[PDB]
Write a protein that holds these residues in place. Sequence first.
Motif, PDB file in Angstrom:
ATOM      1  N   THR A  54       7.874 -10.944 -14.247  1.00  0.00           N
ATOM      2  CA  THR A  54       9.302 -10.879 -13.882  1.00  0.00           C
ATOM      3  C   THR A  54       9.972  -9.522 -14.101  1.00  0.00           C
ATOM      4  O   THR A  54      10.934  -9.169 -13.395  1.00  0.00           O
ATOM      5  CB  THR A  54      10.147 -11.920 -14.651  1.00  0.00           C
ATOM      6  OG1 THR A  54      10.181 -11.584 -16.052  1.00  0.00           O
ATOM      7  CG2 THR A  54       9.605 -13.350 -14.455  1.00  0.00           C
ATOM      8  N   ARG A 143       6.275  -7.158  -3.085  1.00  0.00           N
ATOM      9  CA  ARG A 143       6.111  -8.427  -3.827  1.00  0.00           C
ATOM     10  C   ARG A 143       4.658  -8.824  -3.899  1.00  0.00           C
ATOM     11  O   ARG A 143       3.947  -8.779  -2.901  1.00  0.00           O
ATOM     12  CB  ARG A 143       6.814  -9.585  -3.112  1.00  0.00           C
ATOM     13  CG  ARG A 143       8.326  -9.600  -3.100  1.00  0.00           C
ATOM     14  CD  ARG A 143       8.921 -10.377  -4.267  1.00  0.00           C
ATOM     15  NE  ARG A 143       8.282 -11.664  -4.531  1.00  0.00           N
ATOM     16  CZ  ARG A 143       8.815 -12.848  -4.246  1.00  0.00           C
ATOM     17  NH1 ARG A 143      10.001 -12.940  -3.645  1.00  0.00           N
ATOM     18  NH2 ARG A 143       8.150 -13.951  -4.551  1.00  0.00           N
ATOM     19  N   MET A 144       4.221  -9.250  -5.071  1.00  0.00           N
ATOM     20  CA  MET A 144       2.864  -9.754  -5.208  1.00  0.00           C
ATOM     21  C   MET A 144       2.698 -11.229  -4.818  1.00  0.00           C
ATOM     22  O   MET A 144       1.571 -11.698  -4.600  1.00  0.00           O
ATOM     23  CB  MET A 144       2.332  -9.468  -6.599  1.00  0.00           C
ATOM     24  CG  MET A 144       1.954  -8.001  -6.738  1.00  0.00           C
ATOM     25  SD  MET A 144       0.803  -7.783  -8.081  1.00  0.00           S
ATOM     26  CE  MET A 144       1.808  -8.467  -9.394  1.00  0.00           C
ATOM     27  N   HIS A 145       3.818 -11.933  -4.668  1.00  0.00           N
ATOM     28  CA  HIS A 145       3.801 -13.363  -4.348  1.00  0.00           C
ATOM     29  C   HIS A 145       2.789 -14.131  -5.212  1.00  0.00           C
ATOM     30  O   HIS A 145       2.006 -14.930  -4.704  1.00  0.00           O
ATOM     31  CB  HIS A 145       3.570 -13.575  -2.843  1.00  0.00           C
ATOM     32  CG  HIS A 145       4.739 -13.158  -2.009  1.00  0.00           C
ATOM     33  ND1 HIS A 145       5.752 -14.024  -1.669  1.00  0.00           N
ATOM     34  CD2 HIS A 145       5.086 -11.954  -1.496  1.00  0.00           C
ATOM     35  CE1 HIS A 145       6.664 -13.379  -0.963  1.00  0.00           C
ATOM     36  NE2 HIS A 145       6.288 -12.120  -0.847  1.00  0.00           N
ATOM     37  N   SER A 146       2.819 -13.871  -6.519  1.00  0.00           N
ATOM     38  CA  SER A 146       1.974 -14.572  -7.489  1.00  0.00           C
ATOM     39  C   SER A 146       2.231 -16.079  -7.541  1.00  0.00           C
ATOM     40  O   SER A 146       1.359 -16.833  -7.952  1.00  0.00           O
ATOM     41  CB  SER A 146       2.202 -14.000  -8.889  1.00  0.00           C
ATOM     42  OG  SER A 146       3.485 -14.413  -9.381  1.00  0.00           O
ATOM     43  N   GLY A 147       3.429 -16.510  -7.155  1.00  0.00           N
ATOM     44  CA  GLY A 147       3.815 -17.928  -7.248  1.00  0.00           C
ATOM     45  C   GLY A 147       4.477 -18.321  -8.567  1.00  0.00           C
ATOM     46  O   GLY A 147       4.622 -19.505  -8.867  1.00  0.00           O
ATOM     47  N   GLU A 151       9.768 -13.612 -10.090  1.00  0.00           N
ATOM     48  CA  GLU A 151       9.118 -12.452  -9.479  1.00  0.00           C
ATOM     49  C   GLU A 151      10.038 -11.714  -8.514  1.00  0.00           C
ATOM     50  O   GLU A 151      10.808 -12.322  -7.772  1.00  0.00           O
ATOM     51  CB  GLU A 151       7.832 -12.857  -8.756  1.00  0.00           C
ATOM     52  CG  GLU A 151       6.965 -11.684  -8.324  1.00  0.00           C
ATOM     53  CD  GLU A 151       5.850 -12.114  -7.398  1.00  0.00           C
ATOM     54  OE1 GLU A 151       5.981 -11.911  -6.173  1.00  0.00           O
ATOM     55  OE2 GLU A 151       4.856 -12.667  -7.892  1.00  0.00           O
ATOM     56  N   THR A 152       9.960 -10.390  -8.550  1.00  0.00           N
ATOM     57  CA  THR A 152      10.637  -9.586  -7.551  1.00  0.00           C
ATOM     58  C   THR A 152       9.753  -8.466  -6.957  1.00  0.00           C
ATOM     59  O   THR A 152       8.595  -8.252  -7.381  1.00  0.00           O
ATOM     60  CB  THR A 152      11.985  -9.069  -8.065  1.00  0.00           C
ATOM     61  OG1 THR A 152      12.766  -8.643  -6.947  1.00  0.00           O
ATOM     62  CG2 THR A 152      11.797  -7.919  -9.035  1.00  0.00           C
ATOM     63  N   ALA A 153      10.297  -7.785  -5.951  1.00  0.00           N
ATOM     64  CA  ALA A 153       9.538  -6.789  -5.185  1.00  0.00           C
ATOM     65  C   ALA A 153       9.306  -5.520  -5.998  1.00  0.00           C
ATOM     66  O   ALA A 153       8.211  -4.919  -5.959  1.00  0.00           O
ATOM     67  CB  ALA A 153      10.256  -6.459  -3.880  1.00  0.00           C
ATOM     68  N   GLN A 182       1.890  -5.391 -11.352  1.00  0.00           N
ATOM     69  CA  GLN A 182       1.843  -4.459 -10.231  1.00  0.00           C
ATOM     70  C   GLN A 182       1.218  -3.158 -10.689  1.00  0.00           C
ATOM     71  O   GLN A 182       0.439  -2.578  -9.950  1.00  0.00           O
ATOM     72  CB  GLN A 182       3.251  -4.173  -9.693  1.00  0.00           C
ATOM     73  CG  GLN A 182       3.837  -5.294  -8.842  1.00  0.00           C
ATOM     74  CD  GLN A 182       5.176  -4.907  -8.220  1.00  0.00           C
ATOM     75  OE1 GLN A 182       6.126  -4.536  -8.933  1.00  0.00           O
ATOM     76  NE2 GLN A 182       5.256  -4.972  -6.884  1.00  0.00           N
ATOM     77  N   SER A 200      -6.380 -11.620  -8.329  1.00  0.00           N
ATOM     78  CA  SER A 200      -6.311 -13.081  -8.181  1.00  0.00           C
ATOM     79  C   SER A 200      -6.323 -13.807  -9.507  1.00  0.00           C
ATOM     80  O   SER A 200      -6.899 -13.324 -10.485  1.00  0.00           O
ATOM     81  CB  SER A 200      -7.398 -13.626  -7.228  1.00  0.00           C
ATOM     82  OG  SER A 200      -8.637 -13.795  -7.883  1.00  0.00           O
TER      83      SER A 200
END
Length: 322
Positions: A54, A143-147, A151-153, A182, A200
Amino acid sequence: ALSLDQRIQTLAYEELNKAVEYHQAKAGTVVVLDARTGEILALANTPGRNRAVTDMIEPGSAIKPFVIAKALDAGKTDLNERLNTQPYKIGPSPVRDDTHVYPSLDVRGIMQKSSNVGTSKLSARFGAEEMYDFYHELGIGVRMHSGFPGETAGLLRNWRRWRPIEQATMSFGYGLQLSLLQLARAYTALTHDGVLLPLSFEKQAVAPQGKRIFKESTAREVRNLMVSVTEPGGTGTAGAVDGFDVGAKTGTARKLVNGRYVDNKHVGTFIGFAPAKNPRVIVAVTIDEPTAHGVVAGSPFKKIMGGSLNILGISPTKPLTA
């Protein structure tokens, strides 16, 4: 089939608590990657939110190896050039090393002493737009779109609004933001032979096709130069691991908090990988606002890295001394 390794998680958690308590800091975060696959092997936070994920930070010194890599990759410098590293000005604005003066350094020296002058002059050999694109391809602002929640860009400002002073301060890690994850991600470009990996949370039976950023030989040489950071003479001898060559950076990172007046919170940071020549593990540690007694992020980095290498059956490559 999660990628997380319990032995490593337990080790990360424990050394992190230990370091955070010893320095009386507000909080802390550890990320451990498999340096060849991008599998997250551990991810530990002090209690509260997932700061690894975050929290936007300005990376500080940790970003320097990337500027140096870009300059070597494009042939804008080589391993023989001595740069004039005297403090200097851009417009009114002083650029200086902290707080030594190094009259000149070669590229190894610039890395070794983590020189602001040397880095910012290597950056200045590129246009603002080329540097912008470079930071973007490292994943900065993406953004990593970790889920995970929150989270932000991150922040990469449009290059059209950059001042020459801002290009230079970005090269030594200020004015742009990214999360620890990141940042640890960006380091795969260095360890995985020039190829950035997506990361991953799941075990991998591939492992994934990444995205070329540097020549293999550029990454190989940058890793060798980063060894000088942990050896005598370097700014990060606190992160040396007995028996291994460690490539690393230390620095004080910054975390920005709104609003009435923005709070610049200081964050001790140590990030690195080992064995340097054939890396197997990236470890990243941040420690938020230490208060007592940079050995701050260094000692736990040193312990987590040493312990992770033993856990994974990786043998020392050099003699032990103590």
